[PDB]
């Protein structure tokens, strides 16, 4: 029985003295029996003399030195299973959905090593999406990192909700929304809302699994929520063959949590107050986000940058990982578009000609040129007058404002919220719609016939209905 006695409690950095030759290995998980149930300490050093230095996950307030510790023997093993979908789970893999003990199959270590070069994606793949704006100008990609920008609420969370619905149709996938630095009140609303919109139904089926990591939870537990979440996803991917889409919240709070743990460990935080092991921490996490031969994880991450500084090293490191960036605009939401997506500031690097198909690319390039010209033209056209438009320019304006309306396409989750049943639009059919709009088949069809509709088929119906 590998046991050791607490020999320090300076902060949440608890040094434990183990009897000789009965030493845990680094990254092992220790459990200290406590009236707090357990305190999980993760061994992060060997200080020698048969003592270690560990970090704590659960708070150490009122800890008494010399208390016996028991060594689990390896990085925390968190429950996994289809059963575990629809559970709000704390870092230590215990229900915080409060609907009692998680029904589990197998439990698995929170730390895991990135798959081999061979088991990394050898050729790109384009994950299907149902938002047309997404499907043209930043098509999702399997194993991809898609970094959200723009406000929450009617912004990010509703968008995230839509994706879960779409994913369920798209594959039949699952998700795990991991929320780091989560305001627990807002999280409650999200959980209740997620229940209401039925992406979680525990009287039914719950696709998304929730891991909420509140800000009041210690920094160590803030750091470890992500690694746990990825493991859950990986059980689906590798061992249930699934394709999943894993939401992560703020990576500012990912950085923030890690930075503290480094500083506590005594490691000199590099410039702009960010840990020396900054690169590696993203590196391990975001190289476990990949398309394996068994399945593919795909991760939608939320990238909240502090002070709008993209020059900050942590955002830069994020952008290195990011394959796409989705930049929600509030101006766009104000143009009556839900999608709230800013099409000209939404960009993906997987958008290249061959990558998305030549037709798709050419259509996209035209739509980009159309929108780019529409905006620029509208700048001085508004000032000069709309009648100062050329025949070509007002053809473009006519088409463009029709495209602007065409962007409006309710979201399935937002069936209640907008009041209009969502319009799911498949990627091929999105291209088809734009080919026709480019060819002006719908430039004789009214603007608000494109308002709040989906694909080509949908706007055939609405074209008729707007008139009739």
């Amino acid at each position: 029985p590998i046991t050791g006695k607490v020999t320090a409690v300076i902060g949440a950095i608890v040094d434990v003295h183990f009897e000789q030759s009965e030493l845990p290995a680094i990254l092992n998980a220790l459990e200290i029996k406590t009236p707090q149930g357990k305190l999980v300490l993760e061994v992060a050093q060997h200080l020698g003399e048969n003592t270690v230095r560990t970090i704590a996950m659960d708070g150490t307030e009122g800890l008494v030195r010399g208390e016996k510790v028991l060594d689990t023997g390896g990085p925390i093993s968190v429950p996994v299973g289809r059963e575990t979908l629809g559970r709000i789970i704390n870092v230590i893999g215990e229900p915080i959905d409060e609907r009692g003990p998680i029904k589990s199959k197998l439990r698995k270590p929170i730390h895991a090593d990135p798959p081999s070069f061979a088991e990394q994606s050898t050729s790109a793949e384009i994950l299907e999406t149902g938002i047309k704006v997404v499907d043209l100008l930043a098509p999702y990609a399997r194993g991809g990192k898609i970094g959200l920008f723009g406000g929450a609420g009617v912004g990010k969370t509703v968008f995230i909700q839509e994706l879960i619905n779409n994913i369920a149709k798209a594959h039949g996938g699952f998700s795990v929304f991991t929320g780091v630095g989560e305001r627990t009140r807002e999280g409650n609303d999200l959980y209740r809302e997620m229940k209401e919109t039925g992406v979680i139904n525990l009287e039914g089926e719950s696709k998304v699994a929730l891991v909420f990591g509140q800000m009041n939870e210690p920094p160590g537990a803030r750091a470890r929520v992500a690694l746990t979440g990825l493991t859950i996803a990986e059980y689906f991917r590798d061992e249930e063959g699934q394709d999943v889409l894993l939401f992560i919240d703020n990576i500012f709070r990912f950085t923030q949590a890690g930075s503290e743990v480094s500083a506590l460990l005594g490691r000199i935080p590099s410039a702009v107050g960010y840990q020396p092991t900054l690169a590696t921490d993203m590196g391990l996490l975001q190289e476990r986000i990949t398309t394996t031969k068994k399945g593919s994880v795909t991760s939608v991450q939320a990238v909240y940058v502090p002070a709008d500084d993209l020059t900050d090293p942590a955002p830069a490191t994020t952008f290195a990982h990011l394959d796409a960036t989705t930049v929600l605009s509030r101006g766009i939401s104000e143009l009556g578009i839900y999608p709230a997506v800013d099409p000209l500031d939404s960009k993906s690097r997987l958008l290249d000609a061959a990558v998305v198909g030549q037709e798709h690319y050419d259509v996209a390039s035209k739509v980009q040129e159309t929108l780019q010209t529409y905006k620029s033209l509208q700048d001085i056209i508004a000032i000069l007058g709309m009648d100062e438009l050329s025949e070509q320019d007002k053809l473009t304006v006519e088409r463009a404002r029709k495209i602007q309306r065409f962007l409006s396409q309710p979201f399935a989750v937002a069936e209640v919220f907008t009041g209009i049943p969502g319009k799911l639009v498949r990627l091929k059919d999105t291209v088809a719609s734009f080919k026709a709009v480019l060819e002006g088949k719908y430039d004789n069809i009214p603007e608000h016939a494109f308002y709040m509709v989906g694909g080509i088929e949908d706007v055939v119906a609405k074209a008729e209905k707007l008139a009739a």
């Binding site: 008494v64 030195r65 627990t184 009140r185 409650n188 509140q214 800000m215 506590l264 107050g273």
Partner: protein
């Protein structure tokens, strides 16, 4: 006499001093005694010196246990016996602190008798869970009309009062507390918000004035003032909001509602900086300790509106952050802004231009917002938001030949800006906020000359009070504005406008 009573009390102590574990200071420098002993001590536990000093034990190191002294070093010297009290910090909690200005320990610094409160409960305890909360929907009305309309506040939520130094930041806060007297008088205990003002680093003369003002407005009997004054030591300052929160928990747990105003966490930060540096822990960004985010977050999620199974209660909070140059970009402001759910950012220029409240409408947001807004006030001030938006754009149009629409906006907007002035230290009733804003919405006030707006306001209120306090009470009690009431109001306003 009184002396005899004290001597009797002294006779009443004689307890066996078998101190299971004692300590001896090895060296004491910088208020960081390093003690030999204290084998079984709990972390952060309260320790009593020979000097009588109180401490917490942040560092439990193997060879020495590094007490951080709450007390002054003046009497402390090496070798001092360190009795182990064996109790982690706890403060009296209960309704006993209503109208009681107490220090962190619980000593009544106003000396309004030894605090007799329900229980003494520990200073730090972890924040309510997901399921232990239910969403906010209950308003709270600060009397400040602009606050109530532009950024409507609710219960068990956090939302900043972030603004520039000595703009009477405390004055803006104090106004809310004063309006809580009206609601306090009211029977419902959600309407009884038992306010807690946490005066951090604030000089005792200033807090004495605060206390006196509170006494003048007879507010000390729902108010609680947790005081860590300028002199009060950095451990006391550090634990001061945590200590305060626990007091709030009794109310919250009792299902009641209450409002805790942490003023200012910026001075809390400095105390933590002092502490961290004294323990030689590396100072984080902007030389403010790295776990300041963690510290503030631990405190700030205790502000929560509990679920109805947890007896629908709350601890509303309104943290005050001092912006040194107005920089919300400053590390502590940026962090706090992220943590909280809304901010109100007072504008120094407006303050200078005598517009008190000095609120920067754009840089004030409430995320809960209109969910926690009176329906009546919501109806008659949705318009106000849009009007002000135009007014902001047409602010620069004050540099003239202007479009008639623009010139109208400018007139309407200027009258509105004056209307939202509310002289400091005079709250207003909600039943009197709603008619005035309705008038402005209907453009009735636009016609009234700017100088005569003031005369109009008080007069209109009395005119309404005389003409139809039946309407006012009806409006107040219904809390909604029906088409019939708004109709009558438009008419009533017309009648008043004529005079």
């Amino acid at each position: 006499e009184v002396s005899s009573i004290l001597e009797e009390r002294i006779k009443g102590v004689s307890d066996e001093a078998n101190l299971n574990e004692t300590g001896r200071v090895l060296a004491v420098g910088d208020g960081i005694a390093r003690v030999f002993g204290l084998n079984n001590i709990q972390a952060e536990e309260l320790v009593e010196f020979s000097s009588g000093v109180k401490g917490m034990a942040l560092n439990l190191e193997p060879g020495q246990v590094g007490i951080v002294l709450f007390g002054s070093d003046r009497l402390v010297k090496e070798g001092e016996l360190v009795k182990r009290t064996g109790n982690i910090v706890d403060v009296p909690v209960g309704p006993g602190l209503l109208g009681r200005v107490v220090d962190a320990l619980g000593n009544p610094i106003d000396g309004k008798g030894p605090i007799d409160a329900a229980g003494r409960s520990r200073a730090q305890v972890k924040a309510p869970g997901i399921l232990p909360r239910r969403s906010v929907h209950e308003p709270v009305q600060t009397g400040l009309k602009a606050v109530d309309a532009l950024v409507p506040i609710g219960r068990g939520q956090r939302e900043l009062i972030i603004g520039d130094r000595q703009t009477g930041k405390t004055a803006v806060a104090l106004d809310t507390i004063l309006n809580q007297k009206r609601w306090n008088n009211g029977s419902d205990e959600s309407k009884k918000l038992y306010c807690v003002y946490v005066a951090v680093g604030q000089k005792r003369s200033t807090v004495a004035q605060l206390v006196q003002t509170l006494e003048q407005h007879d507010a000390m009997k729902y108010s609680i003032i947790v005081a860590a004054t300028a002199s009060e030591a950095a451990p006391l300052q550090y634990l001061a909001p945590f200590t305060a929160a626990s007091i709030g928990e009794w109310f919250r747990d009792n299902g009641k509602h209450a409002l805790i105003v942490y003023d200012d966490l910026s001075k809390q930060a400095v105390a933590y900086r002092q502490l961290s540096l004294l323990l030689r822990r590396p100072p984080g960004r902007e030389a403010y300790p790295g776990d300041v985010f963690y510290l503030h977050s631990r405190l700030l999620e205790r502000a929560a509106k509990l679920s109805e199974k947890e007896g629908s209660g709350s601890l509303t909070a309104l943290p005050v952050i001092e912006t040194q140059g107005g920089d919300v970009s400053a590390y502590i402001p940026t962090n706090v802004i992220s943590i909280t759910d809304g901010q109100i950012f007072l504008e120094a220029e407006l303050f200078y231009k005598g517009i008190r409240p000095a609120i920067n409408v754009g840089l004030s947001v409430s995320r809960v917002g209109s969910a926690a807004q009176v329906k009546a006030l919501k109806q008659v001030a949705g318009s106000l938001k849009l009007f002000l938006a135009q007014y902001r754009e047409v602010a620069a149009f004050a540099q003239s030949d202007l479009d008639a629409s623009t010139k109208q906006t400018l007139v309407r907007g200027e009258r509105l800006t004056q209307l939202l002035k509310q002289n400091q230290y005079s709250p207003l009733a909600t039943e009197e906020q709603v008619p005035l804003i309705y008038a402005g919405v209907n453009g009735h006030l636009d016609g009234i000359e700017l100088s005569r707006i003031g005369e109009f306001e008080s007069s209109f209120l009395s005119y309404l009070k005389s003409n139809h306090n039946e309407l006012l009470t009806e409006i107040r009690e219904k809390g909604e504005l029906s088409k019939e009431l708004l109709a009558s109001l438009k008419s009533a306003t017309e009648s008043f406008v004529a005079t």
